[PDB]
Amino acid sequence: LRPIATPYPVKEWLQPKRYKAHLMGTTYVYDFPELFRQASSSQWKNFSADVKLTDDFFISNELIEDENGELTEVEREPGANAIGMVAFKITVKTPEYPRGRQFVVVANDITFKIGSFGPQEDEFFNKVTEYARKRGIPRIYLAANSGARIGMAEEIVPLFQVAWNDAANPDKGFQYLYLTSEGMETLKKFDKENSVLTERTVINGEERFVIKTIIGSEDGLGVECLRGSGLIAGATSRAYHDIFTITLVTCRSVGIGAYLVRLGQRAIQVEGQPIILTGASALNKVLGREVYTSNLQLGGTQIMYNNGVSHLTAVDDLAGVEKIVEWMSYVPAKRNMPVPILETKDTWDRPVDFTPTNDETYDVRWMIEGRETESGFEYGLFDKGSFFETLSGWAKGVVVGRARLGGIPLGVIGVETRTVENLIPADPANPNSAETLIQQAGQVWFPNSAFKTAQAINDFNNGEQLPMMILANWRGFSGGQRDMFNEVLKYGSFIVDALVDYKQPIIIYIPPTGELRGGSWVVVDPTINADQMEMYADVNARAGVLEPEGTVEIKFRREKLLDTMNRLDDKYRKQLADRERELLPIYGQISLQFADLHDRSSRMVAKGVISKELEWTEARRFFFWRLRRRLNEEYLIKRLSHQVGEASRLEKIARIRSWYPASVDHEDDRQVATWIEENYKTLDDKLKGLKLES
């Protein structure tokens, strides 16, 4: 017992595995539920400081496999796990789900065979994934591992013999490895007959059993660990499309551990905990040179967070738990349940304070969440303090996060107007390699930013099942040689694919001072997904194939411009080339203005390419009711889908809208939502009466 004379018992002594975990710079597996209780309690204090919270608000129940491999709940002492993988079913009353929400926590036990993955950990991890998926509840994975388990048939180690070329000189070589009758019997005696594959021969009187394959008695030495890893990689790939999947990296995550981090997509990395494949030491041995310094050089946050593999970093395990808890506050309690409405002090019914100007540089986050000033807080489009930014360390040209719109949770994509710099590090493996600083123009899609956009869209759709708003403001894609070679077309195409797959309301809104040109429009147009998509443009937005400078260059050339001088200039209508020189700069300006006049939201409305033209200060009020209306209608489309079984979206919506009283304006979002909410149970009777099916 160390230390003696403490006020309460030494938990690290009561369970020494707690101390092993601590010595490896991580929380002990069995202590993680407590971090979830601490975080859930903080969630309440930050929401309503006055809430009197008891212990029944949070329940953690360890899951273990029964006699038939069926998962059941247990109340046992920490450290009684016979396998290196552990899981808990958590039932917590949160501000979004005050009656309770459920999720599973799977975790490696770093103190059980170094957190390595053997077939039993793999089988259990897969069974927990399936348990969560069947129930539709989120699956949190806590990664603290050594990757697949590695072994040797340690029983053949003291038994094997070597058939030397010349016994007197061992360095002259050897022919094969073998077992004697003594070795063969030793295995027979311990029922380890299946440990080797032998072939009998007689060499100079001696009966030797030539080892042809070493199998081993102990399960979990090689290929079976790779099979199991594959199973859990496929399991996680499938779970990402089905339930909310998140992973917290606490202590190393190696090999399968690294793929699991990525396969679950959503990841929080604790500072100083690497995400690696082959470690630095092993790589140096392969390269035959001392190339790398640490595993952190290969998979630290300066790699993974900058990569976009790590969505967020965490200062310590509790910080990471707190971030999982916060991320989950935006996500339905289970698959196909409505998005969690959380109304705060920031009511839907106010104008937007922060407005961008053309002459002044701004941070797009100010338009999203607002900004503090000396005169006071300038509210943004979304609920004060609801902007939870993710992928913040990668492709900083796009801003992605979750937010709330008068309570409604949604995914937000904004455009960083400021030039973004990235520091591509020097390759240690190449002596003729130096670090390079890459500057990327604002409002221009690059391979990395287009990749981040598609990724964000997918991550909002799968598991999160959130509506989305893209505050669309791009000049186009980078068409230069470097960016074209770096496959910009591939990443731009992923955006289209992500939108095609989207299953919740989408809102594309070109903000004030905003623009959407050429390929940038193409890739985000509501016809990619007419069922979910909708486009809006601010009265101060611009959009066209080209920008006024390009439109002019192609369509208002020198001849057209001189004919304009002949029409408009009394002096112009040998001596003329002189007036031409004087007029051209202002005439260039006239043509730029002529072009710009086609790029207005009024032409967008007239040409029916946007649902409505909007006023920024009035967007919070508009978007709130539009999304609230749309969430109600989507619910009714889904209930109708079960009934009829076969009909188009248009047929379903037309039918739902035919149930609205004659007095209801189908174009009034506030009225339509108000009516639906006043009649959910009356609409339920309507749908139940429709069960007149054959």
Ligand X SMILES: Cc1ccc2cc(CC3CCN(C(=O)c4c5ccccc5cc5ccccc45)CC3)ccc2n1
**Segment 309-348, which members bind a copy of itself (CB under 8 A)?**
309
- Name the CA dihedral angle for 516, 517, 523, 528, rounded to a multiple of 10 degrees: 80
Residues 547-586 binding ligand X (CB under 6 A) are 547, 549-550, 553-554
Binder to ligand X among 98, 230, 425, 479 (CB under 6 A)? Answer: 479
Note whether 74 and 136 are within 8 A (CB). no
Closest CA to 404 of 624, 616, 243: 624
Alpha carbons 581 and 578: distance in angstroms, whole number: 5
Report, in Å, the least distance between residue 222 CB and ligand X: 12
Binder to a copy of itself among 1, 4, 157, 577 (CB under 8 A)? Answer: 157
Q: Select from a copy of itself, ligand X, none the partner in contact with residue 255, using the beta carbon and a kind-dependent cut-off of 5 to 8 Å.
A: a copy of itself
Alpha carbons 363 and 693: distance in angstroms, whole number: 56
Q: Is 482 in the site for ligand X (CB under 6 A)?
A: no
Return the range that interacts with ligand X (CB under 6 A); candidates 29-37, 124-132, 253-261, 471-479: 471-479
Binder to ligand X among 226, 337, 546, 562 (CB under 6 A)? Answer: 546
Burial 312-337 (b: 16+ CB within 10 A, else e): bbbebbbbbbbbbbbbbbbbbbbbee
Return the range that interacts with ligand X (CB under 6 A); candidates 218-226, 260-268, 415-423, 478-486: 478-486
The CA radius of gyration of the chain, in Å to the nearest whole number, is 32
Closest CA to 339 of 156, 464, 184: 464
Q: Select from ligand X, a copy of itself, none the partner in contact with residue 110, using the beta carbon and a kind-dependent cut-off of 5 to 8 Å.
A: none
Q: Is 480 in the site for ligand X (CB under 6 A)?
A: yes
Residues 284-303 binding ligand X (CB under 6 A) are 285-286
Report, in Å, the least distance between residue 262 CB and ligand X: 17
Q: Is 478 in the site for ligand X (CB under 6 A)?
A: yes
Return the range that interacts with ligand X (CB under 6 A); candidates 301-309, 358-366, 474-482, 574-582: 474-482
401 is in an annotated binding site: no
Q: Is 637 in the site for a copy of itself (CB under 8 A)?
A: no
Q: Is 397 in the site for a copy of itself (CB under 8 A)?
A: no
Return the range that interacts with ligand X (CB under 6 A); candidates 129-137, 196-204, 320-328, 541-549: 541-549
DSSP character for 114? G
Residue showing the smallest CB distance to ligand X in the complex: 550
| Amino acid identity, position 263 | L
Closest CA to 621 of 352, 365, 356: 352
- Name the H helices within 96-164: 119-135
Q: Is 275 in the site for a copy of itself (CB under 8 A)?
A: yes
List the structure tokens of 403.
């937010």
| Amino acid identity, position 283 | L
CB of 549 or CB of 665, closer to ligand X? 549
Beta strands at 206-214 and 253-254: parallel, antiparallel or unpaired: unpaired
Q: Is 653 in the site for ligand X (CB under 6 A)?
A: no
Alpha carbons 315 and 639: distance in angstroms, whole number: 45
Helical axes 576-596 vs 558-568, angle rounded to 10°: 100
Return the range that interacts with ligand X (CB under 6 A); candidates 76-84, 306-314, 477-485, 620-628: 477-485
Binder to a copy of itself among 53, 74, 554, 644 (CB under 8 A)? Answer: 554
Note whether 428 and 292 are within 8 A (CB). yes
17 is in an annotated binding site: no
Q: Is 496 in the site for a copy of itself (CB under 8 A)?
A: yes
Q: Is 606 in the site for a copy of itself (CB under 8 A)?
A: yes
Contacts of 229 (CB under 8 A, 6+ apart): 117, 122, 147, 148, 255, 256, 259
| Placement of tokens 């909708």 in the chain | 534
Residues 19-48 binding a copy of itself (CB under 8 A) are none
Q: Select from a copy of itself, ligand X, none the partner in contact with residue 569, using the beta carbon and a kind-dependent cut-off of 5 to 8 Å.
A: a copy of itself
148 is in an annotated binding site: yes
Binder to a copy of itself among 124, 125, 209, 259 (CB under 8 A)? Answer: 259
Binder to a copy of itself among 211, 243, 472, 627 (CB under 8 A)? Answer: 211
Could you tell me how many residues of this chain bind ligand X (CB under 6 A)? Answer: 19
59 is in an annotated binding site: no
Alpha carbons 326 and 349: distance in angstroms, whole number: 25
Binder to ligand X among 320, 476, 492, 526 (CB under 6 A)? Answer: 476
Closest CA to 342 of 354, 330, 333, 326: 330
List the structure tokens of 355.
């407005």
List the structure tokens of 615.
């006023």
Cα–Cα distance list, 154 to 218, 273, 326, 629 (Å): 9, 32, 47, 67
Note whether 106 and 139 are within 8 A (CB). yes
Q: Is 493 in the site for a copy of itself (CB under 8 A)?
A: yes
557 is in an annotated binding site: yes
Alpha carbons 419 and 85: distance in angstroms, whole number: 45
| Amino acid identity, position 546 | L
Alpha carbons 131 and 647: distance in angstroms, whole number: 33
Alpha carbons 472 and 417: distance in angstroms, whole number: 12
Q: Is 173 in the site for a copy of itself (CB under 8 A)?
A: yes
CB of 496 or CB of 653, closer to a copy of itself? 496
| Amino acid identity, position 402 | R
555 is in an annotated binding site: yes
CB of 195 or CB of 504, closer to a copy of itself? 195
Report, in Å, the least distance between residue 535 CB and a copy of itself: 9
Could you tell me how many residues of this chain bind a copy of itself (CB under 8 A)? Answer: 137
Which positions make up the binding site? 148-150, 252, 519, 555, 557
Q: Which residues are annotated as a binding site for acetyl-CoA?
A: 148-150, 519
**Which parts of this chain interact with ligand X (CB under 6 A)?**
278, 282, 285-286, 441, 444, 475-476, 478-480, 517-518, 546-547, 549-550, 553-554
Binding site for CoA: which residues?
Answer: 252, 555, 557
